[PDB]
Amino acid sequence: NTLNFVRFLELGLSVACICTKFPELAYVRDGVIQFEVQQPMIARDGPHP
Amino acid sequence: NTLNFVRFLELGLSVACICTKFPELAYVRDGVIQFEVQQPMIARDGPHP
Structure with missing residues (x-):
């Protein structure tokens, strides 16, 4: 018998x-590696800083 | 009565x-008869031979 050869790019695990x-x-x-993530802000009034 | 002759090849048992x-x-x-069967092999690391 002859083995079947598996390529990694043909697999569906390559999209992980x-x-x-x-x-x-x-x-x-x-x-x-570096990450620079900024977050949004809400606006409100009252007895809050 | 005339006997009905059966041929082996017309039977579906000949497919086996x-x-x-x-x-x-x-x-x-x-x-x-002779057989030569080979097997694939995977690669790993760590404390495995």
Whole structure:
């Protein structure tokens, strides 16, 4: 018998991740990403600051 | 009454077997069929061999 070969991009699990190639991975001491999220505001009066 | 002859190939039981003729069947000692089956393999990390 001959095996069937599975490719990862053909699977439906590939829409759970975004892959990217990175050759110098062993030289990374620490990698970070940043988020800058701002929130809306309500307006009201009365006995509140 | 005339007897109704039955042929084996018209029956639906012939789909469960493949038939072949062999005139020199009385001179066999041990016929042998052979199989070669391979299996796939997955890759992991951590404390697994």
